């Protein structure tokens, strides 16, 4: 694996420590992206846990998880490139901001696609990747892929909008993930998270109460019902992955297609 095997098309995003760039694989013209990380200032310990993290990326292979392709070490410029799938539709955060700014709600069909495909991504993770809009990506074929938010971080002030009731009291619980999914799907429909506040303490008060507005009336009672169940205060009242996928709303066409 050599950087020379690829040509950079342009930069998609830039963080404090590295960049994400759209690239083209020379051999066959495949369009991909890479994360460019300067590890020059890292300690041996930091570099070791970087290797271990990257190894985990190689472990997951699933149609609804952003696919890892390659890793390239350029020891000359002390840069590491992590090559992954290009998702032409971008991230969900951008989609929500767009709807919010342009005052246009998303189709129920699109929300069902996200629910179906992220629930399957979650199911694979649980077999053995934060559930947040900025970490969910869309390809050019109506597919939805869960990213590695560890990549965004490697490139406190934030309000933890999606924190579950049990998590703010200790997590380590698969049903906590269902709560976060509920928040995400809620925000996709409402163009705002179900619980808002200016501080974490205020937010926590609202979460504990467990009340929120119905998603907009353009969305079916069936869709509102399942999202509302995911936002139950009791983890054991939230539906499992299996129970979500059994919902009559979810059909073959909402799943991934090559
Ligand atoms: C840090 C980065 O993490 C990413 C990026 C991934 N990815 C794969 N194909 C993509 C196409 C677009 C895209 O972001 C866009 C471009 C600019 N818009 C204004 C917003 C949408 C990202 C794409 S996968 C992946 C991961 N960690 O698995 C990232 C994450 C969220 C949003 C942007 C970015 C980036 F801009 F840095 F790329
Ligand atoms: Cl609106
Ligand atoms: Cl609709
Ligand atoms: Cl697919």
């Amino acid at each position: 694996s050599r950087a020379e095997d690829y040509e950079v098309l342009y930069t998609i995003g830039t963080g404090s420590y590295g960049r994400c760039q759209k690239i083209r694989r020379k051999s066959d013209g495949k369009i991909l992206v890479w994360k460019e990380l300067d590890y020059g200032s890292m300690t041996e310990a930091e570099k070791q846990m970087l290797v271990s993290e990257v190894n985990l990326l190689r472990e997951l292979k699933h149609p609804n998880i952003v696919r890892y392709y390659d890793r390239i070490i350029d020891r000359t410029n002390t840069t590491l490139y992590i090559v992954m799938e290009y998702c032409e539709g971008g991230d969900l955060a951008s989609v929500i901001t767009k709807g919010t700014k342009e005052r246009q709600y998303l189709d129920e069909e699109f929300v069902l696609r996200v629910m179906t495909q992220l629930t399957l991504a979650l199911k694979e993770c649980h077999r053995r990747r934060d559930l947040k809009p900025a970490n969910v990506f869309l390809d050019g074929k109506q597919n939805v892929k869960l990213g590695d938010f560890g990549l965004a971080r490697i490139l406190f002030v934030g309000t933890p909008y999606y924190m579950s009731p049990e998590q703010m009291n200790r997590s380590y619980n698969e049903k906590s993930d269902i709560w976060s999914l509920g928040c995400l799907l809620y925000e996709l429909c409402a163009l705002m998270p179900p619980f808002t506040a200016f501080s974490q303490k205020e937010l926590a008060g609202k979460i504990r109460e467990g009340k929120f507005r119905r998603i907009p009336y353009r969305y079916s009672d069936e869709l509102n019902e399942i999202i509302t169940r995911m936002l139950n205060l009791k983890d054991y009242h939230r539906p499992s992955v299996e129970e979500i996928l059994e919902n009559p709303l979810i059909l073959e066409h909402h799943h991934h297609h090559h």
Side-chain angles (χ1 to χ4, degrees), residues 1 3-15 18-57 60-74 76 78-102 104-129 131-152 154-171 173-258:
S1 309
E4 307 103 277
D5 297 331
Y6 302 86
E7 56 188 333
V8 171
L9 290 184
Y10 55 84
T11 296
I12 287 173
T14 307
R19 300 184 292 189
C20 176
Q21 306 186 297
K22 183 191 214 167
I23 69 181
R24 174 200 274 146
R25 184 166 63 192
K26 283 180 177 179
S27 59
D28 63 358
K30 184 150 181 77
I31 302 303
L32 295 156
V33 304
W34 68 20
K35 314 293 156 177
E36 181 181 48
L37 296 49
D38 186 342
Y39 62 78
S41 290
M42 295 179 171
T43 63
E44 299 188 5
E46 292 179 319
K47 284 186 290 189
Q48 181 56 57
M49 66 168 296
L50 185 65
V51 168
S52 69
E53 289 176 337
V54 174
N55 284 343
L56 294 186
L57 257 36
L60 251 177
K61 302 177 169 185
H62 187 281
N64 300 121
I65 292 185
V66 172
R67 182 141 83 103
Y68 164 89
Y69 275 85
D70 201 4
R71 74 185 198 95
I72 310 177
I73 297 84
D74 183 329
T76 295
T78 70
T79 300
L80 163 70
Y81 303 88
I82 300 81
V83 181
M84 60 203 24
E85 171 176 9
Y86 173 63
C87 296
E88 75 165 70
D91 67 299
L92 264 189
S94 296
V95 166
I96 294 171
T97 292
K98 176 181 175 190
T100 299
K101 298 299 185 180
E102 298 175 8
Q104 177 61 57
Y105 287 129
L106 283 301
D107 286 351
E108 177 150 341
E109 284 286 275
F110 177 73
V111 177
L112 295 180
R113 293 196 158 88
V114 175
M115 176 169 65
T116 298
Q117 292 184 47
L118 286 187
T119 295
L120 291 158
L122 192 52
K123 183 180 164 184
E124 178 64 15
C125 293
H126 289 170
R127 270 223 304 100
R128 293 313 178 176
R129 325 208 69 108
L131 242 37
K132 47 172 294 174
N135 186 224
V136 178
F137 303 88
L138 301 176
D139 75 358
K141 303 185 286 197
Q142 299 187 311
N143 303 316
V144 184
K145 284 115 189 295
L146 185 57
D148 164 63
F149 198 63
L151 263 10
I154 303 175
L155 238 61
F156 173 81
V157 298
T159 310
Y161 290 105
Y162 291 12
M163 69 165 180
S164 63
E166 62 275 6
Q167 165 173 322
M168 66 169 188
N169 290 330
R170 58 199 288 165
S171 281
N173 181 333
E174 292 175 7
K175 287 294 186 65
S176 304
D177 291 340
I178 297 299
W179 172 283
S180 305
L181 176 59
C183 289
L184 184 161
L185 292 173
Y186 186 102
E187 190 174 350
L188 194 57
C189 292
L191 301 181
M192 67 187 56
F195 311 99
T196 61
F198 297 117
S199 61
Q200 184 172 153
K201 180 195 185 69
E202 185 194 4
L203 179 71
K206 290 197 176 186
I207 292 168
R208 296 198 214 282
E209 209 69 37
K211 298 179 184 175
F212 42 83
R213 302 190 62 78
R214 191 200 183 272
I215 60 173
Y217 293 104
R218 83 201 313 274
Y219 303 107
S220 65
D221 287 346
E222 289 76 9
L223 179 54
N224 176 68
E225 185 185 63
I226 192 163
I227 292 175
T228 295
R229 294 301 284 180
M230 300 182 200
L231 297 175
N232 201 285
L233 292 172
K234 268 67 174 59
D235 56 356
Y236 52 76
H237 287 331
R238 305 172 198 148
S240 60
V241 159
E242 291 79 12
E243 294 171 327
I244 289 170
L245 296 171
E246 294 172 352
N247 193 285
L249 288 173
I250 294 178
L251 302 166
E252 201 286 335
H253 74 281
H254 299 120
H255 297 69
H256 83 94
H257 302 83
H258 292 287

